[PDB]
Design an enzyme around this catalytic site. Structure first.
Site, PDB file in Angstrom:
ATOM      1  N   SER A 192      -3.772  -6.910  31.314  1.00 38.54           N
ATOM      2  CA  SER A 192      -3.604  -7.262  33.062  1.00 38.54           C
ATOM      3  C   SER A 192      -3.426  -8.544  32.869  1.00 38.54           C
ATOM      4  O   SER A 192      -2.191  -8.368  32.193  1.00 38.54           O
ATOM      5  CB  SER A 192      -5.347  -7.032  33.546  1.00 38.54           C
ATOM      6  OG  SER A 192      -5.314  -8.019  35.039  1.00 38.54           O
ATOM      7  N   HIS A 244      -6.210   1.734  32.493  1.00 34.72           N
ATOM      8  CA  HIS A 244      -6.624   0.938  32.507  1.00 34.72           C
ATOM      9  C   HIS A 244      -6.855   0.334  31.686  1.00 34.72           C
ATOM     10  O   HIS A 244      -7.003  -0.636  31.224  1.00 34.72           O
ATOM     11  CB  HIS A 244      -6.844   0.114  33.884  1.00 34.72           C
ATOM     12  CG  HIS A 244      -6.219  -1.375  33.817  1.00 34.72           C
ATOM     13  ND1 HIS A 244      -4.934  -1.525  34.782  1.00 34.72           N
ATOM     14  CD2 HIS A 244      -6.986  -2.270  34.276  1.00 34.72           C
ATOM     15  CE1 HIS A 244      -5.292  -2.551  35.099  1.00 34.72           C
ATOM     16  NE2 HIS A 244      -6.225  -3.380  34.412  1.00 34.72           N
ATOM     17  N   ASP A 293      -2.429   4.774  35.076  1.00 33.51           N
ATOM     18  CA  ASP A 293      -2.531   3.159  34.791  1.00 33.51           C
ATOM     19  C   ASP A 293      -1.448   3.367  36.190  1.00 33.51           C
ATOM     20  O   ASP A 293      -0.856   3.319  36.290  1.00 33.51           O
ATOM     21  CB  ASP A 293      -1.937   2.202  33.406  1.00 33.51           C
ATOM     22  CG  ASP A 293      -2.518   1.113  33.539  1.00 33.51           C
ATOM     23  OD1 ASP A 293      -2.862   0.376  34.122  1.00 33.51           O
ATOM     24  OD2 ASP A 293      -2.036   0.827  32.359  1.00 33.51           O
TER      25      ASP A 293
END
Length: 296
Positions: A107, A274, A247
């Site tokens: 991330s 994710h 995602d």
């Protein structure tokens, strides 16, 4: 199950860390940069699996949350990318691993990792950018696209509470869950490691709400316009882009990594969003080990 843990001084403050496995055995440490900003290492704890194949793994909490110094009364101009770059450099130095290391950035952490890699530090062997966009601008365009695929009532519920800043309400939260259940974490009930981090954010939301926003898709914090695309051509190490098929970090968000990073490989985990390290625990492990072995 960690071989060492504690804090290291970062100027006036403390940075909390944990090592799994043996730092100076045959393989270089894999240093894990968590997301947010303002998240914690906890949701990445699955990645201790890599020590099974001889890789030391370094988890740490970035400044502002988790085991590191909390600074609730520091504001927007204190929480910068430079701060966290300086913290990562300090941490590699304090642990005595600046000479040889691999970075995995998930991330936000993948964006931080890219900035770090673009300065061409000597000890860096490889970079993984996992579930990480190259630009928050492209991120926000893609969020609008994904949000348009939600049920109409969910879309209206998100819009109403975002407009009036009542995103802490119960009703916004369950609309947000229709998004998270598709694109953030498809396992419900949430894995404990995922919940652990989620609650660390609730208990001190200073960093996440300042830099990002109330949640993954409503990015209204100071990183709203931020892009790392300009530093990507300078990354010299072999880089891996790893995303889930579902995602929120969509193929479009990671495309600049594929077009700009000279040495770069692409992996999509077809039953992940994710958090593929949780969603496809074994396949993520296999993919990581395969990449990591090419570096030794």
């Amino acid at each position: 199950p960690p071989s060492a843990k504690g804090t290291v001084p970062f100027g006036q403050y403390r940075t909390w860390y944990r090592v799994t496995g043996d730092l100076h055995s045959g393989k270089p440490p894999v240093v894990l940069l968590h997301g947010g900003p303002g998240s914690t290492h906890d949701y990445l704890l699955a990645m201790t699996s890599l020590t099974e194949a001889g890789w030391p793994v370094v988890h740490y909490d970035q400044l502002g949350n988790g085991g590191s110094t909390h600074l609730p009364e520091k504001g927007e101009d204190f929480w910068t990318v430079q701060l966290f770059e300086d913290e990562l450099d300090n941490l590699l130095n304090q642990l005595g691993i600046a000479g040889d290391y691999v970075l995995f950035g998930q991330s936000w952490g993948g964006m931080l990792g890219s900035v770090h890699a673009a300065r061409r530090p000597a000890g860096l062997r490889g970079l993984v950018v996992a579930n990480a966009p190259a630009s928050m601008k492209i991120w926000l365009q893609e969020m609008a696209r994904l949000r348009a695929l939600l049920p109409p009532d969910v879309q209206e519920t998100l819009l109403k509470h975002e407009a009036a800043r009542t995103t802490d309400t119960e009703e916004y939260f369950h609309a947000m869950r229709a998004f998270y259940d598709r694109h953030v974490c498809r396992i419900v009930p949430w894995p404990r490691d995922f919940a652990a981090t989620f609650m660390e954010i609730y208990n001190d939301p200073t960093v996440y709400t300042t830099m990002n926003g109330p949640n993954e898709f409503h990015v209204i914090g100071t990183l709203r316009d931020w892009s790392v695309e300009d530093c990507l051509p300078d990354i010299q190490v072999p880089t891996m882009v790893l995303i889930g098929r579902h995602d929120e970090a969509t193929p479009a968000t990671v495309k600049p990594f594929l077009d700009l990073v000279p040495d770069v490989r692409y992996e999509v985990l077809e039953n992940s969003s994710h958090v593929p390290h949780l969603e496809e625990p074994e396949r993520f492990h296999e993919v990581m080990i395969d990449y990591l072995e090419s570096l030794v």
